[PDB]
């Protein structure tokens, strides 16, 4: 598994490969891995499917019921709930977790939080098997207040080299993209990022 | 550790070791290894130091309050049953003990009972109990008359946990003797073995392999 | 996996005197191969004339302690200011550690002070509660090293009188605070050149009827 | 979950469950018992207000608590029962642990105490 | 492990215990009863695990004593087997199961037949002619499958049983010290106090 | 039980005359992935206390929230909150030492070593160490981790005994403590460039230093040195 | 164990302290860690104690004969070359670590040897349970165009934060120059910061104090 | 499983004025079995001593294994080896089993016959070399020899008193240590005789 | 294990070995001689591991009748047991050890006493009074400490042995089949056939 | 560790760092990894030290008697016996190799002998614990017939990225051109390097 958030001048991407295995076996090639937890804070889950999938449903049901008492969460106050849960019960978890949210206020924001249960705000993230043979290229490449396009692409070429070197990694690299004009769902198929 | 009590013509002989130990290292040569419940109860003690030393005492406080409830001294048997059943609940815990429970009632006479971790509780005339255990069987068993005189009693226990505590590397000391009769237990004095085997040595002619 | 137990090194002496007693030990706090403080007090004064130390791991020696000094506040305040004589206090530490049992506060305790009759009185204790009334004791590290050297000056073991063919015993003379001190403090310089847990700094408290006085010693720091 | 204080004193000082509990009690038929010399023998009337029993079965009024003592009563039948089952159960119970039967005197203290408690515990009479 | 045997003949069910009470290097006891009455007409030989033994017996006792005084009657040997047995299927699938195998011997007064019932630790229970827990069925099943007779009358059982124990005592490794006998029947419950040499 | 994931090296410290300083770099390692170069392991306490952190950095969150809480907590129906009935560093300590004590007695630690530094409302400076074990011990120096084996060592150089403290002023404990820092930066794998220091003086209160880096290092003789043995070029 | 090599303008020097321990129990308080290959190349080794010693023995034999064979003086590579190869045969079973250091024809050289076989080449090197206290000192004092003066000084200042700071190490501190154009010397005991202060009393024993049961004398002529 | 604790002993050995003391148990048991009171663990090859304390069997071969060197080596070189020469000569007899070792801890106590200089030396199971001036100790209850040595000695002390003080020592330690004791032999070393003396002790 | 003892008094040594032969649950033989003699004075008794026991027994002897053949000559007692220990020390740090241990009782012609020594397998010897190996020892040890005298004659020797295979019946857990005596003096090794009720 | 070889116009070149932990202690923060086998035929050893030097001291053994009889080995004949060697003794070794050289005929050359024990020639390669972090950028920036100046900033680059990711990487970077005008030892301190 590949994932990336990445945060830019109108907001934030969200990216990933559609990979997921069980052994050497492709049990899924089109695996969607961004999760929508609420209209604008999205995120990208890596480690036990089970478990993400539990946690990314808790966390969606806690902000739903968050919106209906004191209105729209802070990605801040998401990525509490996330943390919260992966913290509390990492004896019995194998999460890694990127949340990623646009806020009217606070615009795109990046929360990680990596197996312990600790959350890291940054600028951008990467995560999942793939991602280890990305950092290089990553901080070499990345620059903050891109644009939508500068950014579309930096996750394009990050994620094709991820899905090269990482045999858990492959399949279509999709992209979600949150800035007050919306939510933009992308795909992109192997035929052309395999050629970057 | 090396204790003992049997019955005989004159009521019962407790004696036990006084060494205590934390694996190859001499703890103490000076812990007392028997238990006054009350005036016609004594304790042994072997095993886990703690162990025996907490419960036994714990012990004589559940036969005190049998006493001021029941207005009247509690049997040797409902004693050790005591101490047998609270071992029994905690089966598997790793409590370590093996336990003599002697004394006398007008209503049983002297008894003995063996009483260990496993939850065993047995009635018996002898019992040798502890490291040193053996040892003391060999020379308490080739000796043994129902007929003993209290005096040649008390010596061939005492010699008995000589014999312990000298081949038991885990046993040694003093010897602690007691006498029961039923007017109660009669104590025999601390017999330290650093003059105790010297002296039976020489006065018995025994021990004959030592050089001295 | 996690240990919850570990050692910090430390050596603790308790001599009792016909009407004093004292509890030393060296001031070293270790882990491993290192040293966490040359000077970490490890004996202490626990109200009603009684010292205590509670040595192994330091983290169980200073939870029991602490239970222990609250204890006597309790004491007080539960039985009219009685004073809880050291004979009290130490079937009351067996119960403190018989209390863990199955998870044992992993120190050898000593504790002294003075009998009902005035005597200088010593205590010690195993991890579980095992306790027993002594001349005296050596605990922690250096234990090994010390034991044989008190049952010799202290208690005059394998001594006879000259001259009477190994057949007179040397009498029991008792020791002075003065004579008490020395055996002490060469305990520990001994102490200190053979075992490289022993060091810095030695903390002497003694107990008389007039109270707690605290005497203090440095060591080899290598 | 029920613990209403149903035996509670009174300004004189009386405790009117308790003390109604007597009334029932004087209600029942009659039963007595005497102490010879070398034994004791126990006593009870047989109530008449209808006839045409099976004697057989309907249940007697001397009951044996052990093989060495017996409890006769007046009062509440059903009420009755419940003592002796608890009665005899202590009496196997004291038999295993302290290896010897009960005296009269204990398992009177016994049967005794299981009603004083019944005098002060909420949600029964 | 020790050694319980039982043989039902014509009239009785006769029950031999070994009296050895051995822990470690040390045989502790030469004359330990394995055996507790549960009724005047009911007896219970066991063996297993050193503390568990004496308390199972000893709570199967008091149970059904107290099933005795409650209702003055006295259950049958079967009723008693059945409730041994449940006690015995409950504990195996508890926190700390009981390590205890015992033979039932009792003579039903309603049907006025003996009966012998082997139950072990797991609650296997099955009612035979002879029957043995631990290593003793192993030289005993083949030598009564041999020698048994259904009509055998309480001397001949007891020349049986002598055969044997003559037979543990030269084949099995261990010294079990001798057995204590008891007779179960019509009459009650009486034990053989000449076995020694009989 | 478990196993920490995140992780903070090195909490070095020392007192001088008129306080104490405490040092700690910005790394978060996740195994020898260098992964986070943000991290401030120092947490400050009102304005007389520090605490550094090392070990488990999710645990170290949890604690900071904890000392929030403290903070908090002590201003309610308190109306000498910032004056004689603020926190102390002791009372920061002995609640920290509680805490890590209570969780290795439920064989579920906190997994961190901890160094709390400040000056005592009588002037008293402050220094005590507490970890996982729930251990706890005070020293003229205190460093865990790496910092144990090669700061104390420097370090203890400037303080050896507690009469050393008073005879020590802000720039040469400061410099002990830098220096200390840049030799961690040359042996210790899991150690960062980017560090944090604060400084609690009884009389200039505290000074927090973000952002600082090992500076003045020496590799040059490093060009000399070829093969590893008999090679020559 | 505390070891350091340190090259200097002409030279090189090596130190080490001589603690010597079985677990925590010091058994030796002055043992000699300084080991000599040739004339004027020395060793100084951690680790299995019999080990190091017999490496180094071994291959001081053959370092002889290879030079009376050669007519040569003998060459710290050479020393290096034989000693690893020798170590790396054995997989690490043979617990050597040492710090080789030694001037020949060609010139001052400081090496460091591990069990399994692997060396390194430096200015400054430190081995040992104090390995760390002693780089601590190195890194923060070394310097390029050491004088044989500050070499010793900077060398004996590392094995002292070993001997201080390290439980494993202690007592006095052994140095050994060697420079390019003269003999090495052997500097035994160059420092000894840690002598046993006078005992508080003699324990001297009055004769007669130990019973005897047997006597007689004891032929050792033939 | 530990071949050093099966059998039990201890050894100590001490340098005075102008002499020297070797000292060991009687002791040879089985784990807590006591099984003989007179198993000595000092020999002699010339006037050099050699102490043997670990696994029982050990002690016995390497004594026989120096009888025969020693004995091959005064043929040879028509002298009797001296006591430095003679710790060598251990040292590679060990490390020679570096692998396969014997589980002993060697004690050597002599007085050189030339420079009539004390000496004595311990050892590990694999030859490394303890050259100590004022004591060496070995056995199962070597702590505590170490602790009654360091408090108990003294320098230059008259082969009387090194007596008293070096058994004082070993008895003392002794009496901590479950599989020590049972016996003692004290061998008090000057270059023209040697007294050998049997001690009384605690017998349990 | 097997029984082992052994006990010198003032002109002969007397060796006693149990005759039991048990493999699992089954004693197999209960006559065997666990003894060889190696040469006219000298026998030796053992105990251990299954086969290595006779092997190791049988080797040894015929070494020694080797050496007799050769010599024409009995080496002693003590020349005999210090070849046994070499094998045995040579055996323990081989590729399978001979698990055995023996008790050597010789008669030393030329010194004219009798003599005792204990081997264990790793090749410890000893020379005593009275041995024993395996279990046996924790119970005759003292017992011997107690009763032994240096100037016993044979026959009270065999009274002493008598005393102690009375407490191995007694206290020790398995049947080891009573002993099988032989007494060692200036005359030889003869053996005591009436010991079953001496 | 982490160590590369590149090819390029003139010949090509080694880089590796010169970090050695034994843990997360630094043994040696100036390590030479750059070992050389012949006058132009290095190679960057990663794995067991004790190995690596053991595998470097026999092959360079190998090449010297070859050079004796035969002349000049090819630097395909260098990897040969590295090969032999690792491939063998697979099970008592752990080396992995890159061997660089450069031969007047055949130019510069680059062949890597990874764990097991096999042989890979290759235009560039890269190994080592840090490796991992610059498979994404390397691939990404790497260009056939590069010049010296470029060969010698790819290289500078990459291991920057790998010595701030990795650890067990650290130190100086250094290098080694090998190409027709003979062999020049390049170094590059933290302060440069750092900042790129």
Not at chain 2, 1 to 19: C, E, H, K, W
Not at chain 2, 118 to 134: A, E, H, M, W
Not at chain 5, 120 to 145: C, Q, R
Not at chain 6, 124 to 147: E, I
Request: hydrophobic share 35%; net charge negative; charged share 25%.
């Amino acid at each position: 598994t590949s994932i990336m958030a990445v945060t830019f001048k109108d907001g934030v991407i969200l990216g990933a490969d559609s990979r997921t295995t069980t052994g050497a076996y492709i049990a899924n090639r089109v695996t969607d891995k961004l999760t929508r937890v609420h209209d604008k804070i999205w995120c990208c889950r890596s480690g036990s499917a089970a478990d993400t999938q539990a946690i990314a449903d808790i966390v969606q049901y806690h902000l739903e019921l968050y919106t209906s008492q004191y209105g729209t969460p802070s990605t801040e106050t998401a990525a509490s709930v996330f943390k919260e849960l992966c913290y509390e019960n990492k004896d019995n978890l194998t999460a890694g977790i990127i949340v990623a949210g646009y806020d009217d206020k606070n615009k795109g924001e990046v929360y990680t939080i990596p197996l312990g249960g600790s959350v890291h705000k940054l600028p951008y993230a990467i995560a999942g098997s793939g991602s280890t043979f990305i950092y290089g290229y990553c901080d070499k490449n990345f620059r903050e207040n891109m644009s939508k396009e500068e950014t579309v692409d930096f996750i394009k070429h990050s994620l094709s080299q991820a899905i090269k070197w990482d045999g858990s990694s492959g399949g279509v690299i999709r992209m979600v993209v949150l800035t007050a004009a919306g939510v933009e769902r992308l795909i992109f198929y192997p035929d052309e990022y395999e050629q970057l | 550790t090396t204790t003992l009590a049997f019955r005989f013509q004159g009521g019962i002989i407790v004696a036990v070791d006084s060494r205590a130990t934390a694996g190859n290292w001499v703890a103490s040569q000076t812990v007392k290894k028997v238990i006054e419940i009350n005036p016609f109860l004594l304790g042994t003690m072997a095993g886990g130091a703690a162990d025996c030393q907490f419960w036994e005492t714990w012990l004589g406080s559940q036969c005190r309050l049998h006493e001021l409830r029941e207005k009247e001294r509690i049997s040797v048997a409902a004693a050790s049953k005591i101490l047998s059943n609270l071992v029994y609940q905690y089966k598997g815990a790793g409590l370590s003990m093996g336990t003599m429970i002697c004394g006398y009632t007008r209503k049983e006479g002297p008894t003995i009972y063996y009483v260990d971790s496993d939850g065993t509780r047995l009635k018996g005339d002898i019992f040798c109990v502890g490291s040193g255990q053996t040892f003391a069987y060999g020379v308490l068993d080739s000796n043994y008359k129902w007929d003993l005189s209290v005096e040649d009693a008390l010596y061939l226990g005492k010699r008995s946990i000589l014999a312990a505590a000298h081949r038991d590397a885990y046993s040694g000391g003093s010897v602690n003797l007691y006498h029961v009769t039923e007017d109660g237990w009669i104590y025999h004095g601390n017999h330290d073995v650093g003059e105790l085997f010297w002296k039976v040595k020489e006065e018995e002619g025994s021990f004959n392999n030592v050089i001295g | 996996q996690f240990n919850p137990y570990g050692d910090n090194g430390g050596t603790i002496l308790g001599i009792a005197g016909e009407d004093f007693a004292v509890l030393a030990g060296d001031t070293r706090n270790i882990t491993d191969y290192s040293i966490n403080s040359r000077y970490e007090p490890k004996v202490f004064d626990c109200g009603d004339n009684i010292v205590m130390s509670a040595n192994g791991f330091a983290a169980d020696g200073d939870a029991l302690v602490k239970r222990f000094k609250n204890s006597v506040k309790w004491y007080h305040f539960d039985h009219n200011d009685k004073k809880l004589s050291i004979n009290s206090a130490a079937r009351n530490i067996q119960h403190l550690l018989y209390g863990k049992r199955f998870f044992p506060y992993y120190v050898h305790t000593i504790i002294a002070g003075l009998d009902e009759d005035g005597k200088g009185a010593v205590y010690s204790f195993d991890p579980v509660g095992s306790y027993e009334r002594e001349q005296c004791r050596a605990g922690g590290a250096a234990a090994s090293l010390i034991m044989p050297f008190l049952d010799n000056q202290v208690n005059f073991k394998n001594q006879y009188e000259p001259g009477t063919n190994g057949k007179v015993k040397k009498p029991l003379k008792y020791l002075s605070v003065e004579e008490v001190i020395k055996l002490v403090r060469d305990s520990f310089t001994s102490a200190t050149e053979r075992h490289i847990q022993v060091g810095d700094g030695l903390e002497i408290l003694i107990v008389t009827k007039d109270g707690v006085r605290k005497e203090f010693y440095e060591l080899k720091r290598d | 979950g029920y613990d209403r204080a149903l035996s509670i004193f009174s300004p004189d000082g009386h405790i009117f469950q308790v003390e109604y509990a007597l009334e029932a009690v004087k209600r029942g038929t009659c039963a007595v018992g005497v102490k010879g010399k070398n034994c004791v023998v126990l006593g009870c009337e047989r109530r008449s207000t209808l006839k045409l029993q099976d004697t057989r079965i309907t249940p007697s009024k001397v009951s044996k608590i052990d093989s060495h003592v017996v409890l006769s009563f007046s009062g509440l039948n059903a009420d009755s029962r419940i003592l002796i089952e608890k009665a005899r159960v202590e009496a196997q119970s004291h038999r295993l642990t302290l290896e010897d039967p009960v005296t009269v005197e204990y398992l009177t203290r016994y049967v005794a105490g299981v009603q004083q408690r019944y005098t002060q515990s909420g949600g029964v009479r | 492990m020790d050694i319980i045997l039982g043989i039902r003949v014509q009239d009785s069910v006769i029950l031999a215990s070994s009296k050895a009470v051995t822990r470690g290097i040390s045989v502790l006891k030469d004359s330990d009863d394995k055996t507790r009455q549960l009724s005047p007409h009911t007896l219970m030989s066991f063996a297993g695990e050193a503390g568990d033994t004496v308390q199972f017996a000893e709570y199967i006792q008091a149970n059904i004593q107290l099933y005795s005084i409650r209702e003055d009657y006295e259950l049958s040997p079967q009723a008693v087997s059945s409730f041994v047995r449940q006690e015995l299927a409950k504990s195996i699938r508890s926190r700390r199961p009981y390590q205890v195998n015992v033979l039932i011997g009792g003579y039903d007064k309603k049907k006025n037949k003996p009966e012998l019932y082997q139950i072990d630790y797991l609650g296997t229970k099955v009612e035979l002619p002879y029957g043995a827990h631990g290593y003793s069925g192993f030289y005993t099943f083949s030598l009564l499958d041999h020698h048994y007779r259904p009509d055998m009358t309480t001397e001949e059982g007891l020349d049986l049983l002598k055969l044997c124990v003559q037979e543990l005592e030269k084949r099995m490794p261990m010294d079990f010290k001798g057995v204590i006998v008891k007779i179960v029947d019509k009459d009650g419950i009486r034990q053989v106090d000449d076995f020694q040499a009989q | 039980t478990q196993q920490p994931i995140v992780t903070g090296t090195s909490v070095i410290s020392m007192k001088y005359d008129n306080g104490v300083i405490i040092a700690a770099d910005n790394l978060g390692s996740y195994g020898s992935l260098l992964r986070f170069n943000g991290v401030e392991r120092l947490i400050p306490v009102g304005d007389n206390t520090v605490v550094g952190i090392s070990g488990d950095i999710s645990d170290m969150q949890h604690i900071e929230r904890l000392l929030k809480d403290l903070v908090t907590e002590n201003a309610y129906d308190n109306p000498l909150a910032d004056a004689e009935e603020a926190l102390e560093p002791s009372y920061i300590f002995e609640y920290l030492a509680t805490v890590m004590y209570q969780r290795r007695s439920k064989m579920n630690p906190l997994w961190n070593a901890i160094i709390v530094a400040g000056v005592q409302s009588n002037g008293d400076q402050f220094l005590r160490y507490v970890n996982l074990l729930g251990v706890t011990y005070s020293s003229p120096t205190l460093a865990t981790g790496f910092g144990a084996h090669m700061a104390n060592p420097l370090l203890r150089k400037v303080v050896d005994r507690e009469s050393d403290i008073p005879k020590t002023t802000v720039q040469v404990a400061e410099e002990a403590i830098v220096n200390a820092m840049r030799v961690l930066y040359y042996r210790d794998a899991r150690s960062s460039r980017n560090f944090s220091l604060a400084i609690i003086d009884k009389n200039t209160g505290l000074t927090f230093k973000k952002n600082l880096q090992v500076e003045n290092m020496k590799w040059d003789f490093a060009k000399d040195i070829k093969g590893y043995g008999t090679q020559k070029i | 164990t505390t070891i350091v090599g340190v090259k200097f303008n002409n030279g090189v020097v090596i130190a080490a302290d001589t603690r010597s321990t079985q677990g925590p129990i010091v058994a030796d308080k002055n043992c000699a860690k300084l080991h000599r290959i040739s004339p004027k190349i020395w060793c100084a080794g951690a680790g299995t104690a019999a080990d190091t010693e017999a490496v180094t023995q071994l291959i001081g034999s053959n370092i002889e004969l290879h030079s009376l064979y050669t007519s040569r003086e003998p060459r710290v590579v050479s020393a290096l070359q034989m000693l690893k190869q020798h170590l790396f045969k054995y997989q690490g079973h043979i617990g050597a670590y040492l710090i080789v250091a030694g001037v020949d024809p060609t010139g001052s050289h400081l090496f460091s040897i591990h069990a399994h076989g692997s060396t390194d080449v430096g200015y400054y090197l430190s081995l040992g349970s104090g390995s760390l206290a002693a780089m601590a000192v190195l890194e923060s004092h070394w310097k390029q165009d050491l004088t044989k003066e500050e070499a010793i000084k900077l060398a004996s200042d590392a094995i002292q934060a070993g001997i201080w700071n390290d439980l494993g190490s202690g007592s006095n501190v052994d140095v050994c120059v060697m420079e390019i154009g003269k003999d090495a010397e052997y500097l035994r005991n160059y420092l000894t910061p840690n002598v046993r202060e006078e005992k508080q009393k003699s324990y001297k024993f009055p004769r007669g104090t130990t019973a005897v049961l047997k006597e007689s004398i004891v032929n050792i002529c033939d | 499983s530990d071949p050093s604790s099966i059998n039990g002993g201890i050894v100590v050995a001490m340098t005075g004025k102008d002499c020297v003391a070797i000292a060991c148990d009687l002791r040879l048991g089985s784990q807590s079995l006591g099984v003989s009171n007179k198993f000595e663990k000092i020999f002699h090859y010339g006037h050099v001593f050699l102490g043997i304390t670990g696994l029982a069997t050990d002690v016995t071969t390497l004594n026989e294994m120096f009888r025969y060197k020693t004995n091959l080596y005064k043929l040879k070189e028509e002298r009797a080896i001296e006591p430095e020469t003679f710790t060598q000569l251990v040292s590679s007899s060990l490390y020679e089993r570096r692998f396969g070792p014997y589980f002993v801890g060697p004690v050597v106590a002599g007085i050189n016959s030339k420079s009539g200089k004390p000496f004595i030396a311990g050892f590990d199971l694999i030859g490394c070399i303890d050259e100590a001036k004022d004591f060496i100790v070995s056995g199962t209850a070597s702590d505590q020899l170490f602790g009654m040595c360091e408090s108990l000695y003294e320098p230059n002390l008259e082969p009387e008193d090194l007596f008293e003080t070096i058994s004082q020592a070993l008895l003392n330690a002794a009496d901590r240590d479950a599989l020590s004791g049972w016996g003692a032999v004290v061998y008090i070393i000057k270059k023209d005789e040697v007294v050998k003396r049997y001690l009384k002790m605690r017998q349990d």
